[PDB]
Amino acid sequence: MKDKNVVVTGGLGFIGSHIVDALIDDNKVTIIDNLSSGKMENLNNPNHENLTIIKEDLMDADLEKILKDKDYVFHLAALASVPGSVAEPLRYNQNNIDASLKLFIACKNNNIKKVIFSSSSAVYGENPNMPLKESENFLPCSPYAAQKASCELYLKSFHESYGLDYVALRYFNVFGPRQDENSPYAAVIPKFISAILNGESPVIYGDGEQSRDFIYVKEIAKANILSAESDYNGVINVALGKSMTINRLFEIISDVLESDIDVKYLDERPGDIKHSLADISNLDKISFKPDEDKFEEQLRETVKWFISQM
Amino acid sequence: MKDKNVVVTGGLGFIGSHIVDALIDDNKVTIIDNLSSGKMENLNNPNHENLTIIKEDLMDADLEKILKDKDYVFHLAALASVPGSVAEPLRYNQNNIDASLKLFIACKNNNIKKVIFSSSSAVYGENPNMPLKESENFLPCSPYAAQKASCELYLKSFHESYGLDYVALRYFNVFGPRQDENSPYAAVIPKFISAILNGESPVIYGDGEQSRDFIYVKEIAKANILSAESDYNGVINVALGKSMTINRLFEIISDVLESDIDVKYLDERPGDIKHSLADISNLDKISFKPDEDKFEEQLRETVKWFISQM
Ligand SMILES: CC(=O)N[C@H]1[C@@H](OP(=O)(O)OP(=O)(O)OC[C@H]2O[C@@H](n3ccc(=O)[nH]c3=O)[C@H](O)[C@@H]2O)O[C@H](CO)[C@@H](O)[C@@H]1O[C@H](C)C(=O)O
Ligand SMILES: CC(=O)N[C@H]1[C@@H](OP(=O)(O)OP(=O)(O)OC[C@H]2O[C@@H](n3ccc(=O)[nH]c3=O)[C@H](O)[C@@H]2O)O[C@H](CO)[C@@H](O)[C@@H]1O[C@H](C)C(=O)O
Ligand SMILES: NC(=O)c1ccc[n+]([C@@H]2O[C@H](COP(=O)([O-])OP(=O)(O)OC[C@H]3O[C@@H](n4cnc5c(N)ncnc54)[C@H](O)[C@@H]3O)[C@@H](O)[C@H]2O)c1
Ligand SMILES: NC(=O)c1ccc[n+]([C@@H]2O[C@H](COP(=O)([O-])OP(=O)(O)OC[C@H]3O[C@@H](n4cnc5c(N)ncnc54)[C@H](O)[C@@H]3O)[C@@H](O)[C@H]2O)c1
Ligand SMILES: [Zn+2]
Ligand SMILES: [Zn+2]
């Protein structure tokens, strides 16, 4: 992508910062981010000539004005937490549905060429029909999952009502540089890496045979950019279509870190589904083929990032 | 249902007033209604000893307090318009998602035994797989349809997260006494009846071969009450599972009114789907069998109501 003027909501966050990095040399980029979880220092160059940063909540921003003469909108801003949403459903509704809708209204009023929306495999709930096809019904188990599904439904309705073109991307388990490790809720790869680097035993919730479809953050960024350039409108899973158990993950991370620190086993967390696996056939719709044998290399890059932060 | 204390949101409206009528002799009923479209005079007895009316927007009401010690909540309050939602998606979002969520939060915090939610066959969009089963995916064509679907998804998530029991009822084409005829958007049965009573030719948008699954408002009220009493949680179509063309409807209404006024034919309305038909198998889940040969009787009751309003 070259010579476009794009908006990246949540562009100071984990995933959004990697999208900004990939676009910024050849495109004007306006980030809208309230710093609720993102950081200026997540950007490779936060002073880049092509960059604009608007430090504001989407609910307050004049999105009708900001989106004038923009080409594409990448919507990553969200309160991105399943357990957080259970504790605070109304606040999550404001950030995840209401703000998204305000953005989508400004998109259609400004004739934005495409919206690329960050959804989640959480919308599937506990579905045994793996590998999970996009045609599965929604089975949201948390307010967060209902919110992402609601946004997908609004996008469908905006396509029909106003001709707004969009891709909704259902991410599976994203990992990589700049992912949070500090929250009680933080993802397993950051927790395993952080624990080992701090000389502490990590923990597994359950027996460790649970499995996930992990996908590297730079691949998510590529999928976003390819979706913007595609003529396809609709919903696409973004993953590798491969399973890894948490036991196996721990072995691999321990090998990468040359670590003899052992893992502890605790009871299962309520709400954790046992197995999650994407069907990624529809990645053909955006001409995306993720790298299928680069997990160790990606983990090494992630570890090096966490080392640099100590 | 006897000796319960219930809340009916939108209880001064078309459908809600019939639910209030059916419950009020044997139960305490609190209506919450902002009079945006409902009327005091829709109730059979607006001064009934068991009645309380709170004239307030759901967004402003202290629902946490109002729902203390209530048994059931019937949620009918909404901005109930497909074309209105296209014109004003944010305002419709506030009334249809945000207010519903505030209510559902108060329901789960007060351990309400059941929520009975008014959804719509609009959530199916233009789906040729008739008769339409509840398992069909959502295909919302308007912000309204997305909003009703979002509410259904929130209810599912609240069942999983908090144990809130619910039934979402997908109404097909409701008709009967107290339905609005004055809006530009008003439903076909009121428009046909009102036109003929005013000595004016009604209009058909298209060729009249379009068909709908019409369902009488008193049957909707019964389905609501049976759903409250049922152990079932989930989503159920409420209809007859029968089709009637708009041409045939006009013939029947003209016969009932002994009218020689002819109908005019105009171009199709954008957004109108041609055929809509419910699969009503899952009405067995709430032990409801609607009357299958009472259409003329129901139309006569509707006509007599419109006559009484002249
Ligand atoms: C925090 C995070 O990134 N979570 C994301 C991740 O969930 P989840 O699959 O629950 O991710 P995990 O917590 O990393 O759990 C994955 C597995 O790892 C075990 N585990 C986790 C932590 C630990 O210390 N020990 C341990 O054993 C755990 O029991 C589970 O089996 O993937 C989902 C998509 O597939 C996202 O919806 C979800 O939220 C994102 C933000 C969003 O939607 O915006
Ligand atoms: C106003 C109203 O009650 N509309 C409801 C009705 O829609 P619709 O099926 O569009 O209902 P119609 O407008 O009565 O249209 C039905 C058919 O009749 C023709 N027609 C309509 C008017 C007229 O003058 N002449 C004429 O020919 C028209 O072209 C169509 O084929 O049924 C749906 C459920 O099946 C509801 O979602 C919808 O909104 C409710 C509020 C809600 O969800 O809350
Ligand atoms: N990390 C994952 O595994 C994962 C999986 C599935 C979906 N997602 C989705 O991808 C997107 C990005 O997630 P992430 O992991 O980068 O999360 P993140 O918290 O790092 O990024 C979200 C960014 O949005 C900003 N933000 C939040 N609310 C805002 C508001 N109201 N106005 C303006 N800015 C706001 C935050 O400050 C942050 O920089 C989210 O929509 C998330 O739900 C992530
Ligand atoms: N009429 C139909 O054919 C049909 C079909 C499918 C679904 N529904 C649904 O059934 C329910 C009732 O529809 P109806 O036809 O009786 O509509 P209606 O407009 O007659 O009733 C809605 C009632 O809610 C009140 N209201 C609206 N917004 C409110 C708010 N924010 N706070 C408090 N009160 C509010 C109105 O004053 C009105 O009395 C709605 O949820 C509607 O979407 C109706
Ligand atoms: Zn297993
Ligand atoms: Zn036909």
The string of DSSP letters for chain B reads --S-EEEEETTTSHHHHHHHHHHTTTSEEEEE---SS--GGGSS-TT-TTEEEE-S-TTTS-HHHHTTT--EEEE--S---HHHHHH-HHHHHIIIIIHHHHHHHHHHHTT-SEEEEEEEGGGG-S--SSSBPTTSPP---SHHHHHHHHHHHHHHHHHHHH---EEEEEE-EEE-TT---SSTT--HHHHHHHHHHTT---EEESSS--EE-EEEHHHHHHHHHHHHH-S--EEEEES-S--EEHHHHHHHHHHHTT--PPPEEEPPPTT--SB--B--GGGGGGT----SS-HHHHHHHHHHHHHHT-
B145: distance to nearest CA of chain A, Å?
Answer: 8
B150 annotated ligand binder: no
B-chain residue closest to A96, CA distance: B98
Mutation pick from B126, B135, B160 vs chain A, by most beta carbons of A within 10 Å, is: B160
Contact status, residue A215 vs residue A174, Cβ threshold 8 Å: yes
CA pair distance A228, A113, nearest whole angstrom: 8
Output the CA A130–ligand 4 centroid distance in Å: 40
Q: DSSP secondary-structure letter at A261?
A: P
> CATH number, domain at A133?
3.40.50.720
Contact status, residue B233 vs residue B159, Cβ threshold 8 Å: yes
Quote the distance between the C-alpha of residue A94 and its chain's center: 19
CA pair distance A51, A221, nearest whole angstrom: 17
Q: After which residues is chain B broken (C to N over 2.5 A)?
A: none
Distances in Å between the Cα of A86 and the Cα atoms of A125, A141, A290, B159, B176 are 15, 9, 33, 12, 40
Candidates B173, B194, B200: which one to mutate for ligand 2, based on the most atoms within 8 Å of Cβ? Answer: B173
Q: How many residues does the structure list for chain B?
A: 310
Listed residue (B65, B70, B156) closest to B117, CA to CA: B156
> Is the alpha carbon torsion for A228, A231, A234, A235 positive or negative?
negative
Q: B264 has which bridge partners?
A: B203
Contact status, residue B72 vs residue B3, Cβ threshold 8 Å: no
Q: Specify the long-range contacts of residues A191-197, CB closer than 8 Å, at least 24 apart.
A: A192/A249, A192/A250, A192/A253, A193/A253, A193/A257, A193/A302, A193/A303, A193/A306, A194/A306, A195/A261, A196/A253, A196/A254, A196/A257, A196/A259, A196/A261, A197/A257, A197/A303, A197/A306, A197/A307, A197/A310
Residue B220 burial (CB count, 10 A): 26
The range of the structural domain enclosing residue B171 comes to 1-175+213-239
- Looking at all shown ligands, the one closest to residue B78's CA atom is 4
**Residue for token digits 């929520």?**
B115
Of B135, B146, B157, which is closest to A145 when you measure between CB atoms?
B157
> Is the alpha carbon torsion for B239, B168, B123, A233 positive or negative?
negative
Contact B161/A at CB under 8 A: yes
Task: Please tell me whether residues B221 and B259 are part of one structural domain.
Answer: no
What is the token pair recorded at A118?
């960050």
Residues 6+ apart with CB under 8 A from B285: B230, B232, B234, B236
Burial A137-150 (b: 16+ CB within 10 A, else e): ebbbbbbbbbbbbb
> CATH number, domain at A185?
3.90.25.10
A217: distance to nearest CA of chain B, Å?
Answer: 28
Task: Please tell me whether residues B163 and B181 are part of one structural domain.
Answer: no
For B141, phi and psi rounded to 5 degrees? -105, -10
* CA Rg value for chain B: 19
What is the token pair recorded at A273?
């589904």
B308 by Cβ neighbours in 10 Å (0-12 / 13-18 / 19+) ranks as exposed
Task: Please tell me whether residues B124 and B192 are part of one structural domain.
Answer: no
**Residue A207, helix vs strand vs coil:** coil
Task: Please tell me whether residues A263 and A167 are part of one structural domain.
Answer: no
Check CB contact under 8 Å for B142 and A156. no
The domain boundary residue, chosen from A239, A254, A289: A239
Q: What method was applied to determine this entry?
A: X-ray
CA pair distance A128, A277, nearest whole angstrom: 10
Task: Please tell me whether residues A109 and A141 are part of one structural domain.
Answer: yes
Of A105, A146, A153, which is closest to B146 when you measure between CB atoms?
A153
The domain boundary residue, chosen from A239, A256, A281: A239
Q: What amino acid occupies position A143?
A: P
Task: Please tell me whether residues B98 and B182 are part of one structural domain.
Answer: no
Residues 6+ apart with CB under 8 A from B171: B15, B118, B119, B120, B121, B215, B220, B238, B239
Which residues in chain A touch residue B102, judged by CB atoms under 8 angstroms apart?
90
Output the CA A248–ligand 5 centroid distance in Å: 13
Check CB contact under 8 Å for A146 and B143. no
Contact status, residue A243 vs residue A303, Cβ threshold 8 Å: no
Mutation pick from B91, B152, B154 vs chain A, by most beta carbons of A within 10 Å, is: B154
What is the token pair recorded at B264?
């005019």
Total domains, chain A? 2
